[PDB]
């Protein structure tokens, strides 16, 4: 039994990568069907309830800059927000946030349910359907068939689907992956534990969006065995209306036997009780070397792979692949050719190149070879290098495309204004200038020229009388400040 309407794009699984690949093809214009196991569990986080951190944050920001969901999603869902290495410089900072599981689930389901051009249907799968080497739709478990011009596969594979794939010279793999126990926050003594709060002012994951979006903030809690430099295990709350604690740090692979000791032998957690047991699922995947730069199979035409089937664990890594697969699966149906960001452009750049060639994600320490690329690929400038390319190809609406150009203006203007507004050995303004400047002034310099001074911050500089009102576009301000201050390096 076929199905009434034909689809351009089918997405199978829709987990983390799927969801993103869906929202992708949809806002592209194209008419997309998301098929899934279960729609009550979209945006479920099975591992760590968190978005961000080293390298992860980079990949997120990038997705948002191409208009995906995750950033917005976490902005709605994050009960704790942190910039890693606020201490150090722009190239080295990384945003990470704690997630209220349920609120994230809420947020992810909604945006999808209300996505123009995407239709969503709650069924398993049996196999897919190929015009001998060029795929044309898929067949659900219940026997219902949907036709399409392009497909995207994610979670689900591991039987008729399975055997079909092995009928090809696809290198199969193996993955050990599992999660810690989970603890009844009611049976934990928190008073005896230290606590971790969030940076303040709150960071904000989307280039769009802001702090008013975030729900109520909450702290994590530090604990360890029984500061002599011990091994600290972070206790994260699963959400605002949960009593479950994800104990970050304690071992994934473990019998329940020990599982209850390793947790009870911890400060405050003497008589803790353990609500979900920990475990490990090994699942096999396929080797990504059999995938075009655009994540289209080198074997079957029209098929794109993203997420678990590529051996990556990690929401952010899935999310990124999703988007990419999505937008190309989209471009295939429009009978145009797919896109693949080059290593110099983004993390998603390397992530896919890596996977295509290497067949795997190389560690983050290695994503940027020199020092310029570490600065030029920082997280807080994805929009400026990515957004437009996305706009140029459908991803990125008007709301965002207007916000982009707004701030693209404010940077252009301010820079130019600061290049032009000079203050001389006493323009008799030099009195209050030297109050916050290290070495005495004179050489007769423009705002730009003494912004480049290590003592000077755009925010402070501008409180000074000759340098006009500051910009009230704080995103742009930061980009202006670091543009003069650290593209002094690229000079």
Give binding residues for FAD as ranges.
13-18, 125, 308
What part of residues 147-206 is at the interface with a second copy (CB under 8 A)? 184, 186
Q: In angstroms, rounded to a whole number, what is the distance separating the alpha carbons of residues 284 and 420? A: 61
CB–CB of 139/128 below 8 Å?
yes
> Which residue of 47, 84, 119, 340 would you call a contact of a second copy, by CB under 8 A?
119
CA distances to 93, 114, 198, 202, 211 from 217, in Å: 21, 27, 8, 10, 11
Whether the CB-CB separation of 34 and 112 falls below 8 Å is answered with yes
Count CB neighbours of 298 within 10 A: 14
- Residue 216 interacting with a second copy (CB under 8 A): no
Among 44, 360, 424, 446, binds a second copy (CB under 8 A): 44
Q: How far apart are CA 407 and CA 204, in angstroms?
A: 16
Using CB under 8 A, which of 256, 369, 405, 420 touches a second copy? 256
Residue 114 touching a second copy (CB under 8 A):
yes
Sign, Cα dihedral of 201, 206, 209, 212: negative
- Is 131 a binding residue for a second copy by CB under 8 A? The answer is no
* Run of H or E residues at 228: none
The answer to whether residues 304 and 295 touch, using CB atoms and an 8 Å cutoff, is yes
Among 86, 142, 168, 427, binds a second copy (CB under 8 A): 142
Binding residue numbers: 13-18, 125, 308
Cα separation values, 71 from 18, 59, 178, 465, Å:
15, 10, 25, 38
Q: Which of 102, 130, 408, 445 binds a second copy (CB under 8 A)?
A: 102
Asked if 243 is part of the footprint of a second copy (rule: CB under 8 A), the reply reads yes
Hey, which residues between 48 and 87 contact a second copy (CB under 8 A)?
A: none
Question: Cβ neighbours of residue 40 under 8 Å, at least 6 residues apart?
Answer: none
The stretch near a second copy (CB under 8 A) out of 121-129, 158-166, 339-347, 443-451 is 121-129
Residue 1 near a second copy by CB under 8 A = yes
123 binds a second copy (CB under 8 A): yes
Binding mask 409-448 for a second copy (x = CB under 8 A): ----------------------------------------
Where would I find the beta strands (DSSP E) of 63-161? Answer: 78-84, 94-99, 118-121, 127-131, 134-139, 145-147, 150-153
Q: Does 110 bind a second copy (CB under 8 A)?
A: yes
41 binds a second copy (CB under 8 A): yes
Binding site for a second copy (CB under 8 A): 1, 4, 39-41, 44, 102, 106, 110, 113-114, 119-123, 142, 144, 184, 186, 241-243, 256-257, 260, 273-277
């Amino acid at each position: 039994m076929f199905y009434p309407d034909p689809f351009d794009v089918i997405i199978i699984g829709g987990g983390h990568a799927g969801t993103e690949a869906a929202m992708a093809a949809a806002r592209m214009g194209q008419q997309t069907l998301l098929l899934t196991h279960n729609i009550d569990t979209l945006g479920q986080m099975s591992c760590n309830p968190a978005i961000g951190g080293i390298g992860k944050g980079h990949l997120v920001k990038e997705v948002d800059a191409l208009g995906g969901l995750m950033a917005k999603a976490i902005d709605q869902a994050g009960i704790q927000f942190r910039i890693l290495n606020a201490s150090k410089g722009p190239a080295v900072r990384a945003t990470r946030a704690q997630a209220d599981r349920v609120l994230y689930r809420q947020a992810v389901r909604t945006a999808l349910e209300n996505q123009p051009n995407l239709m969503i249907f709650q069924q398993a799968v049996e196999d897919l359907i190929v015009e001998n080497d060029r795929v044309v739709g898929a067949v659900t478990q219940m026997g219902l068939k949907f036709r399409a011009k392009a497909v995207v596969l994610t979670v689900g594979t591991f039987i008729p689907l399975s055997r079909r794939l092995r009928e090809l010279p696809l290198r199969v793999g193996r993955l050990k992956t599992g999660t810690p126990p989970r603890i009844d926050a009611r049976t934990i003594d928190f008073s005896v534990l230290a606590q971790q709060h969030g940076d303040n002012p709150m960071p904000v994951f989307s280039f769009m969006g802001n702090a008013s979006q975030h729900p109520q903030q909450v702290p994590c809690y530090i604990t360890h065995t029984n500061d002599r430099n011990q091994h600290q295990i972070f206790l994260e709350p699963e959400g605002l209306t949960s009593n479950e604690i994800y104990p970050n740090g304690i071992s994934t692979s473990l019998p329940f036997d020990v599982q209850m000791q390793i947790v009870r032998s911890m400060q405050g957690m003497e008589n803790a009780k353990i609500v979900r047991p920990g475990y490990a699922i090994e699942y096999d995947f396929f080797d990504p070397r059999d995938l075009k730069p655009t994540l289209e199979s080198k074997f079957i035409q029209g098929l794109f792979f993203a997420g678990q089937i590529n051996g990556t664990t990690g929401y952010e890594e899935a999310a990124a692949q999703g988007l990419l697969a999505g937008l190309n699966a989209a471009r295939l149906s429009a009978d145009k050719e797919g896109w693949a960001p080059a290593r110099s452009q983004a993390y998603l750049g390397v992530l896919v190149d890596d996977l295509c060639t290497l067949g795997t994600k190389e560690p983050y320490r290695m994503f940027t070879s020199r020092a310029e690329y570490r600065l030029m690929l920082r997280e807080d400038n994805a929009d400026l290098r990515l957004t437009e390319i996305g706009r140029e190809l459908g991803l990125v609406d008007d709301e965002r495309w207007a916000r982009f150009n707004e701030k693209l203006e404010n940077i252009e203007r301010e820079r130019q204004r600061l290049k032009s507004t000079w203050v001389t050995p006493s323009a008799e303004a030099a009195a209050e200038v030297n109050a916050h400047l290290t070495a005495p002034l004179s050489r007769e310099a423009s705002g730009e020229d003494l912004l480049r001074r290590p003592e000077m911050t755009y925010e402070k500089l501008t409180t000074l009388t000759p340098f006009a009102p500051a910009l009230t576009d704080e995103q742009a301000a930061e980009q202006v400040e670091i543009q003069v201050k650290y593209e002094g390096y690229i000079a």
